[PDB]
Amino acid sequence: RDFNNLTKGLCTINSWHIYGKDNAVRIGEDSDVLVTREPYVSCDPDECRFYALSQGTTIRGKHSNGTIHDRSQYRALISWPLSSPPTVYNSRVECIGWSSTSCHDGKTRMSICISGPNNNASAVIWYNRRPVTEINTWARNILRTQESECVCHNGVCPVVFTDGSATGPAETRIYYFKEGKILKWEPLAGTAKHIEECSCYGERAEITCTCRDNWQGSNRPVIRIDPVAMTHTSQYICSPVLTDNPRPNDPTVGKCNDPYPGNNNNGVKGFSYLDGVNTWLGRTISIASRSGYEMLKVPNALTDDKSKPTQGQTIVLNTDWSGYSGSFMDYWAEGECYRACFYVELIRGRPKEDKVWWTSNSIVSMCSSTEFLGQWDWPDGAKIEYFL
Amino acid sequence: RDFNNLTKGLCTINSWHIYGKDNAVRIGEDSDVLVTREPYVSCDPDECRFYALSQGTTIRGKHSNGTIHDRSQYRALISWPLSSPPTVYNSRVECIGWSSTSCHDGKTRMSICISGPNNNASAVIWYNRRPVTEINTWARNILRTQESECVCHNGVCPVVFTDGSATGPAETRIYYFKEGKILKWEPLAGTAKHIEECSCYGERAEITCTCRDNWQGSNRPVIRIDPVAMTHTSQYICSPVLTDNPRPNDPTVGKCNDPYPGNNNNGVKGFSYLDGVNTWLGRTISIASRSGYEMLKVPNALTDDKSKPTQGQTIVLNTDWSGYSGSFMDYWAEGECYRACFYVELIRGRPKEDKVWWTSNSIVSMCSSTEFLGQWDWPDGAKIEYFL
Amino acid sequence: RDFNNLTKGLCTINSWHIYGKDNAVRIGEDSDVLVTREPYVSCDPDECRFYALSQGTTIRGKHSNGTIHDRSQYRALISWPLSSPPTVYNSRVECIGWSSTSCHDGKTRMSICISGPNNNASAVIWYNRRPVTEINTWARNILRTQESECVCHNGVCPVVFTDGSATGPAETRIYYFKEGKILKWEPLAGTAKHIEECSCYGERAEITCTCRDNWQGSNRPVIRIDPVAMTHTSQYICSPVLTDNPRPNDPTVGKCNDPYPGNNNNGVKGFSYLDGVNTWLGRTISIASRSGYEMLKVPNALTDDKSKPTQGQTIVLNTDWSGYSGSFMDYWAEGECYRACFYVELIRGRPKEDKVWWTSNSIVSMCSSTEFLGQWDWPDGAKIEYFL
Amino acid sequence: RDFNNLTKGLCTINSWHIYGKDNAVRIGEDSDVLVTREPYVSCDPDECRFYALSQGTTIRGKHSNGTIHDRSQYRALISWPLSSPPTVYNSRVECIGWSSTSCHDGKTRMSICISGPNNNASAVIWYNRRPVTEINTWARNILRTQESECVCHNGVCPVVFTDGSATGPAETRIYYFKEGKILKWEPLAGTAKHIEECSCYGERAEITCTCRDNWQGSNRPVIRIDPVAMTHTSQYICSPVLTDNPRPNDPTVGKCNDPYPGNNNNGVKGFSYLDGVNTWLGRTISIASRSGYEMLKVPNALTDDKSKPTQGQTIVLNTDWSGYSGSFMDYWAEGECYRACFYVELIRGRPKEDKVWWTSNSIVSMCSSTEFLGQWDWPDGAKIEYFL
Ligand SMILES: *[C@@H]1O[C@H](CO)[C@@H](O[C@@H]2O[C@H](CO)[C@@H](O[C@@H]3O[C@H](CO[C@H]4O[C@H](CO)[C@@H](O)[C@H](O[C@H]5O[C@H](CO)[C@@H](O)[C@H](O)[C@@H]5O)[C@@H]4O)[C@@H](O)[C@H](O[C@H]4O[C@H](CO)[C@@H](O)[C@H](O)[C@@H]4O[C@H]4O[C@H](CO)[C@@H](O)[C@H](O)[C@@H]4O[C@H]4O[C@H](CO)[C@@H](O)[C@H](O)[C@@H]4O)[C@@H]3O)[C@H](O)[C@H]2NC(C)=O)[C@H](O)[C@H]1NC(C)=O
Ligand SMILES: *[C@@H]1O[C@H](CO)[C@@H](O[C@@H]2O[C@H](CO)[C@@H](O[C@@H]3O[C@H](CO[C@H]4O[C@H](CO)[C@@H](O)[C@H](O[C@H]5O[C@H](CO)[C@@H](O)[C@H](O)[C@@H]5O)[C@@H]4O)[C@@H](O)[C@H](O[C@H]4O[C@H](CO)[C@@H](O)[C@H](O)[C@@H]4O[C@H]4O[C@H](CO)[C@@H](O)[C@H](O)[C@@H]4O[C@H]4O[C@H](CO)[C@@H](O)[C@H](O)[C@@H]4O)[C@@H]3O)[C@H](O)[C@H]2NC(C)=O)[C@H](O)[C@H]1NC(C)=O
Ligand SMILES: *[C@@H]1O[C@H](CO)[C@@H](O[C@@H]2O[C@H](CO)[C@@H](O[C@@H]3O[C@H](CO[C@H]4O[C@H](CO)[C@@H](O)[C@H](O[C@H]5O[C@H](CO)[C@@H](O)[C@H](O)[C@@H]5O)[C@@H]4O)[C@@H](O)[C@H](O[C@H]4O[C@H](CO)[C@@H](O)[C@H](O)[C@@H]4O[C@H]4O[C@H](CO)[C@@H](O)[C@H](O)[C@@H]4O[C@H]4O[C@H](CO)[C@@H](O)[C@H](O)[C@@H]4O)[C@@H]3O)[C@H](O)[C@H]2NC(C)=O)[C@H](O)[C@H]1NC(C)=O
Ligand SMILES: *[C@@H]1O[C@H](CO)[C@@H](O[C@@H]2O[C@H](CO)[C@@H](O[C@@H]3O[C@H](CO[C@H]4O[C@H](CO)[C@@H](O)[C@H](O[C@H]5O[C@H](CO)[C@@H](O)[C@H](O)[C@@H]5O)[C@@H]4O)[C@@H](O)[C@H](O[C@H]4O[C@H](CO)[C@@H](O)[C@H](O)[C@@H]4O[C@H]4O[C@H](CO)[C@@H](O)[C@H](O)[C@@H]4O[C@H]4O[C@H](CO)[C@@H](O)[C@H](O)[C@@H]4O)[C@@H]3O)[C@H](O)[C@H]2NC(C)=O)[C@H](O)[C@H]1NC(C)=O
Ligand SMILES: CC(=O)N[C@@H]1[C@@H](O)[C@@H](F)[C@](F)(C(=O)O)O[C@H]1C[C@H](O)CO
Ligand SMILES: CC(=O)N[C@@H]1[C@@H](O)[C@@H](F)[C@](F)(C(=O)O)O[C@H]1C[C@H](O)CO
Ligand SMILES: CC(=O)N[C@@H]1[C@@H](O)[C@@H](F)[C@](F)(C(=O)O)O[C@H]1C[C@H](O)CO
Ligand SMILES: CC(=O)N[C@@H]1[C@@H](O)[C@@H](F)[C@](F)(C(=O)O)O[C@H]1C[C@H](O)CO
């Protein structure tokens, strides 16, 4: 009925409780589960759902052969009920394409899918399940966006896009949408040197995005957006607790306004919640591959170039595969504060498990507790050998 | 609540963006997907859906053997959520039969299915999911209709039917329905010499249908209908850019009031949007078979017998199978103009791929953009060899 | 909102048009379709659905072995969307048991299932999807009811039950329900000598049921019920056009108040519409087995012991299996009269096709037209050999 | 709209009628049915549903190997339509974990899942499908709860938890929730010496729970809770009709305030309805294993240490497997009294049927009748050999 406004601050994060888990690959071993990757979670005022890019085949289907590839005509943004698997029979298609974002503004949902060949991609912006706006590639090199939910304030839903090189300077733009229409866009500003796959959350009328510097940075760039003034800035997380992957070993002092060097041309989508002493960072446990996942409480990580962990929680053991992770919150829960949440994509199959011809994932997701809860670990749980 | 009125003109068509794609044959390789053909798309005020004639079997089922045949007791008009595949578990049956049309008048949906043996077929007209009117065969030779959506204006939904020869003069009638009841019908008038499978759209209180002259014409007949006066006329697209299939090579000058010769007794359902300089024609790229699909901007194609393309867009490469194509619009979108849309049926299996015993299709669909968007191609994507 | 009242007469029946067909056995060859038998159709004010007794297994499942048996703990009344098949994933369970009826009174649905061993069965009467009343066996011999929809008038929904011998005198009772509670019951009166499986319809405040005399009659008993006075009478169809199965050949004169002899201890559920000159009878074409199905217009069949057909329609060829048939109408359609409808169960498998270990059916259903429509035939369409 | 209040007494229980049965294992032999255990039933004001702990795999799936284990990261509370099976495509996930309860307070549903390793488990309390409260393990030994529905009165929904030894003293707490928040909790009081898996029901503003003393008792402990004062007491069922399993043979005199000895360190979840002369107890027929199930009318069982059966009903024969059983009622049915209901879990597979590698169940459920209804027995019905 009214546009949602970001009027609350973050709740105190003292631990993470289990929120949703779909066990998709385990169940998909013998049921009609779509192959996916690049999942996320997003809430409407009455329902929270799982989202992902389908590969337009089931995991047991012969067409799963080749699904390591990221961009094909057979991909689509799909959504499905929380903690169910993305099946053929219960998945709703939001739009067609191989890069996406989606968010509800309090009245209805905007969803964005990019499709096309590398040199001629375009974004279609859907609002209230109708296409409204289209945006053509500006740099003719894989126009691409967040792969997790956007955030809205009073109708204004900013979205970060990047078009251009994955291994050198690219052209990043912030579009400010309302009802699916472009109110304004700006080129990237501040000191972030490369931006991909922003993970965003909203509190007290401000939107914070933690992104992936694929080119040089093992610290993560951060964009902070004012959705009333429609202006932004960017920097890196200052902390020596480095949160991309792959990455070098943690130093004692990080970098605020430049990429922390050591790994070039690679990375993973990730997120953080940056809120003074209430600051938690996600990362893979391995510095080498997408294995393991932990949350670390790192007070003032954004602004303190020597901040180190004061607390932590294991999400996925380093003997289990992880993948993309990102932020969402239920902006429509009752209560005085917004409860931080996140998901981790648990990638199975290629390239690490190459006895199968497919790549897919399942999802685990947690939200914060003000309790100090006991931890478990949350692996995908499938036995690859069953698929041989 | 009120009947919809065609009060808008067409938006400017500067390119086509991806709208929906179900990847049915790829997914159907290992999931319970119904065999179909003759698909289309149609919008209600709150939802747009895929439609097709089911063959009353799954593609992996042994009963798919023989589904090259067009008319059996096991066919039905089914609909299903946009870009999902037509599965056993998510397909809604509209009515029983082997030829159909369907359209929403703003209050509720009329759907029409024809069934019966060739010499004794009948149409049942459903309105608000109840049968209301029945129409018996008048020429005792395969009573048949549009195979794509009809259009309504103030409750009046005209529908084109043909009964009689596919290879000689036949009896074409235009019925004017309201709430499922016959207000009036007229025999075909104007200069179109044979009519099948009209693809219709509505703008500024007028309904334009592009049809298939199966008997002699490689140019397409056009019926223009006034749904207030309930009168119509017909002619052919004047343009030398010939849009049936199979067809001869394009000439320099077309024919306005007669079939353009060169191919007899064959054709394919197709469509155009005819709007002065804003005129786009669809066709197969091959002149010989249902391969490839392109959109061509052909200014004043309807009225200019020498008009040639000023712009174009590839939809399906000539190394991929196409099939039937037709028009629909979301008459209930917000905004100042109606956004032209279309689908292309991507036929797989027999007769061209005869190593399988079945015939089926999947669907791709696009709508117009006022941007000049980059193009991709959109094949079915299934590997027939997986089905061997 | 209000109880429905039977305030209309029957429409003129000049032919039958196709209404619904689920092709369940064809589709069930390779999808998760439940084994059923004893199907029917029943309308709510907003929706008409298919109903049947499930056998609590799929047709391809190993537990379909043995489903020739009528009464087990694994049966339930299920319903599902019109013309879809009864699948595991789309079938709604109404209640548990192996004999049923169901009807909507304009406010909500009453459904009745009987379960139990032969000597200790009981009916549970559900209303608004809650159990309300229970009725214990009175004759300790397979308490059983209509296997097709009941009819309501001003809240009053009479239902016919029989308890006792299938091959001799039994105890038949008519219960008058309102909101699931017993207002009254009466023992069978009039001249019908044995009653099973009544097929009912309602017009002008009167409910007519055509039933099965399993003991002696090849003519069908008829119960006429006044749902305001809650009284009834019974007789047989007088016509020599005999409509049970198996049966002797048709005579020239039938019997009004006694069973027409020639076949003992056997029969099939069937129906008629008895409305003066507007009278149509259903029967199997074979006098020997459940093969073929036709509708015959037999003016004054109920009251004229020499009435013969003046018109007819083939529904199922005598080279195709039929089965149970029964009546329903959409009491909530718009218009001045009620449109007669019926279904025919198309039984496949045992005992006639004993190369499979299962028994199941699919459904075909038609409603009357005031047109003289062309006829087709409507077989199940499955190839038993595919199931070997 | 308003919180439900327990304002009715129990209806007179003269027998039990069949309520729901899903036949899950029979159907699951060839369809995508999830492996479960620990099922129950719970009503909302408009719908009653089946609930269970999923094992995050189908029964035919290779991941069903190992599902004898109770606690894994792949378990979740799921619900699904009454008498349908828990399939991949129709099961709704309530929350993630391996121990649960759920109840509707008249406005919305509270659901509670516990997850974690044995020494660090936590409960998450969901209300209106959002997480609201979290409770950390207090005794670091498998925090666990009812495995059947809780009961609410005026918003207050008490829940029994136990943390600590299964074979010695443990710490049992009663939490009083409202809108998902903790109003109060108390440590267990009264004379019950060990509490697990309480089966609860509500009448005349009082909640009665029959539980499992795993440590020493073959009589069942009972907790009676006042949800207005938020206080409780506990004792055992006094009756010599002993209702745990395994158990010694029935004596002539039971124990009111102590465990009846004979079996240590084992038991099964069960229930009773304790209402003076209207008192019925459930138990397994075997004293040795979870085989058979009967209901016994035992007047004043709670308070009379010599009470013996005056009536009974067989639910499951002693030649069929049973399992957990528990109580629920439809608090929103019309009428002057609440109708007692219960379910029995029918466990199949390991450890008793060890030719399969899985453990699963199906469900049967009954409600009371004021009639003296004939009895049937209600086995799972699957043939284990089909799964070999
Ligand atoms: C039941 O559940 C409980 C709740 O989960 C669980 O208790 C939790 O236990 C976990 C696991 O131990 C704790 O997480 C750790 O937290 C560490 C920080 O806390 C320490 O440091 C603080 C600041 O000085 C102290 O305040 C704090 O003390 C207080 O709390 C204590 C409770 O544990 C209590 O006993 C104390 O007396 C006191 O009150 C405490 O001493 C955190 O540092 C640690 O993370 C590091 O270690 C992990 C390896 O285990 C790494 O995976 C992680 O990445 C961090 O180390 C890496 O990075 C650092 C920063 O750069 C580097 O310095 C390190 O060298 C290391 O770097 C290497 O590895 C990297 C990752 O691979 C790589 O990138 C680098 O390049 C390099 O190779 C962990 O998060 C959690 O906080 C506890 N929670 C609570 C509320 O207590 C309990 O155990 C369970 N109970 C049972 C019975 O099972
Ligand atoms: C990224 O995305 C971009 C957007 O899609 C894409 O750019 C697009 O490129 C396509 C593919 O080239 C363009 O489509 C073509 O459009 C042609 C018409 O445009 C020409 O002619 C105009 C009129 O004289 C000129 O105004 C126009 O110039 C302007 O625009 C230019 C941009 O391309 C610019 O460079 C110019 O300087 C200027 O500003 C331009 O010169 C259209 O004619 C063509 O269709 C024909 O060709 C296809 C074969 O390629 C056939 O499949 C098609 O059927 C048409 O040819 C057939 O039919 C004609 C009519 O009868 C016959 O004359 C021909 O002989 C031929 O007939 C044979 O074949 C038939 C079909 O099989 C058969 O039936 C016959 O019997 C016979 O055998 C095509 O549609 C598109 O317009 C561009 N869109 C835009 C906005 O620019 C860009 O390339 C992508 N970028 C990258 C980097 O990949
Ligand atoms: C396109 O669609 C059209 C619409 O469906 C279709 O036309 C229809 O054609 C069917 C099939 O022929 C017609 O059904 C038949 O109707 C017969 C009754 O009509 C006749 O009798 C009337 C009364 O005297 C005449 O008024 C009537 O004449 C009028 O209409 C004519 C149109 O056909 C027109 O030409 C005339 O000039 C005139 O205006 C007409 O003469 C009906 O009797 C018949 O049923 C019997 O026959 C079937 C065998 O074909 C049996 O299966 C059926 O059971 C009936 O016969 C059995 O039972 C009788 C009663 O006891 C016995 O007397 C018989 O001996 C026989 O009994 C044996 O078999 C039993 C069943 O197995 C068994 O139980 C017994 O023991 C014994 O063994 C049939 O229903 C239909 O009415 C036409 N509809 C219309 C509107 O015209 C048209 O053909 C299709 N067009 C094309 C081009 O394909
Ligand atoms: C059609 O449907 C009808 C409705 O279901 C069905 O009739 C029902 O029949 C069942 C099965 O017989 C009845 O259930 C039994 O009820 C017994 C109690 O009723 C008796 O005792 C009363 C009190 O003295 C008498 O009032 C009562 O008489 C009245 O009713 C009669 C109707 O049957 C009528 O004929 C009379 O004239 C009169 O009006 C009647 O005499 C109940 O005791 C019995 O339960 C015990 O027996 C079962 C074994 O069959 C055990 O499984 C069960 O556990 C109970 O025995 C065990 O426990 C007792 C208590 O400790 C011990 O004393 C026993 O020794 C025994 O203990 C062993 O076994 C235990 C379990 O394994 C073990 O734990 C122990 O350690 C030890 O090893 C049973 O519930 C039902 O009440 C009838 N219902 C009605 C309304 O009539 C009818 O038969 C069907 N009709 C047809 C035609 O099929
Ligand atoms: C899931 C998994 O086995 N992760 C291990 C981790 O347990 C660990 F052994 C590791 F060496 C690592 O990268 O930390 O190697 C991973 C595999 C490797 O980095 C890419 O092949
Ligand atoms: C899909 C496909 O292969 N189309 C080719 C086109 O690529 C092309 F090669 C063609 F020759 C054509 O008709 O244009 O032949 C088609 C096949 C043929 O016309 C019928 O067999
Ligand atoms: C379906 C079918 O084949 N019906 C034929 C009918 O075509 C016919 F040949 C018949 F002889 C008949 O009963 O009319 O026999 C049926 C089979 C038989 O009565 C029982 O086996
Ligand atoms: C289902 C079943 O066979 N139950 C029988 C009962 O029929 C019975 F024979 C029994 F001995 C019993 O425990 O009563 O043994 C059960 C199996 C045993 O207790 C554990 O293996």
Ligand SMILES: CC(=O)N[C@@H]1[C@@H](O)[C@@H](F)C(C(=O)O)=[O+][C@H]1C[C@H](O)CO
């Ligand atoms: C939480 C848990 O492990 N519950 C299991 C249950 O899954 C189930 F497996 C079970 C059982 O079947 O007996 O026992 C309980 C635990 C007992 O109550 C002893 O404390």
Ligand SMILES: [Ca+2]
């Ligand atoms: Ca990087």
Ligand SMILES: [Ca+2]
């Ligand atoms: Ca032609």
Ligand SMILES: [Ca+2]
């Ligand atoms: Ca008979």
Ligand SMILES: [Ca+2]
């Ligand atoms: Ca015990």
